[model samples]
Target: ATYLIGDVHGCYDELIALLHKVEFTPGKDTLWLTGDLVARGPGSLDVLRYVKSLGDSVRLVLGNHDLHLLAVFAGISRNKPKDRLTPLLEAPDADELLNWLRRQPLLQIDEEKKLVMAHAGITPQWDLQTAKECARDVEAVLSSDSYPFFLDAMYGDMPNNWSPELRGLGRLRFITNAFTRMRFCFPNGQLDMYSKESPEEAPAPLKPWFAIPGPVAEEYSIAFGHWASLEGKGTPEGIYALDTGCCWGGTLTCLRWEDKQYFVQPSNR
Candidate 1:
């Protein structure tokens, strides 16, 4: 069986309990992580180490917080007090863990399961092929000698949209945002990175990325974990919302792919 869980945010105990409830035999079963694995929780180091130990049984997608952690590790960004990942940064195996983390891709697609996973989501503006290309573009730099260069340029909100002709760091930034930080888009399909409100609470002219119809959603199911404001609801069919704000005193959510059954665990902290 395959299970998909929302942002861990270092809630290792809750995550373990959820798995135990499902009787998840890690090597015999598969777990898909929705990202934000660290930050704002009591056990980020434990969570990272646990996931890494799971090996091939775990499928991962990097979240915004995860990227910020990478930026901090690169010495290109400041570490925020709120994230509270000192343990992770100070771990004896920190170098090894961060290396494995940086090599992860921004997008993961399952042809057999017909599911697409990303930390936030694959934007409506780009089809699967386009998303793949853009993800690869960033994947290379993130794992290469140019990592620090891209990390330095990855923080801004400029461009605010996607286009085929856009090149260089601007293009990389858009792809990164769409995959890890996006929540809403205007009617014209421009990415809106600021608004984090749920769709019902948000003002008009702004739509949740999944609500905007596009080529990718037409073909494969999109599953994401950002925007815990949704609390795992308000999505149209085929669009799965995994983030349940576990780090914010909300429950952690898990989707059983074989049956689409959802299991939840209350946050511990």
Candidate 2:
């Protein structure tokens, strides 16, 4: 069986409780995490260590907070005092843990199941193949020796729209933003990277990316976890919003892939 879990956000105890509640058998079952595995909670270090320990039993995509952790590791972004990531940074196994993290992809797919997993939603402009290719492009750079170069250049929301002609840092930025930061977008699929509002609250000309009519929405089943404001609600059919905001004192959610059932752990804090 395969279970897709929502954003953990360093809530390690909650994750363990959720797994126990679902009767997760690590060797017999597979776990797919929707990312933001670290940050904003007290157990960032423990969460990273535990997930890494799970080894082949787990797969995860990189979320905005995950990318921010990478950027901080690369010295491109400052570590905020409140982020609760310093323990991770100062761990004796920090290098090993972070190196494993940088190797994770922005998108993961199960063609047989016709499911795609990403931190945020996929760009409406790209088909599954194109989206996978774009993810590989960024992954290649991230896993290469010069990864710090790209991480340093990974900020900003310029060229908020996608174009096949985009190249280098510009292209990488767009791809990363689409998979990890996107929420609402314009009718043309131009991303509104700054908005954190729910669909009902977002301003005009901006609609949830999945709600906008597009081939991506029509073709694949997406399991993603970036927008916690949705509270695990209102995604289009086949599109799963798994982030239940455990880090913000909400529930930790997991969806059973075989049965499409939800198992949740109410936040203890």
Candidate 1 local lDDT, residue 186: 92
lDDT of each: 0.89, 0.90
Off by over 4 Å in 1: none
Candidate 2, 42-69: lDDT as tens digits: 9999999999999889988989898899
Backbone clash total, candidate 1: 0
TM-score of each: 0.98, 0.98
Cα RMSD (angstroms) for every candidate in the order listed: 0.9, 0.9
Candidate 2 ranges beyond 4 A from true positions: none
Candidate 1's residue-wise lDDT over 76-118, tens digit each? 9989888998989999999989888888878889999889999
**Top model by lDDT, which number?**
2
What does candidate 2 score on TM? Answer: 0.98
lDDT of 2 at 174: 90
Clashes of each: 0, 0
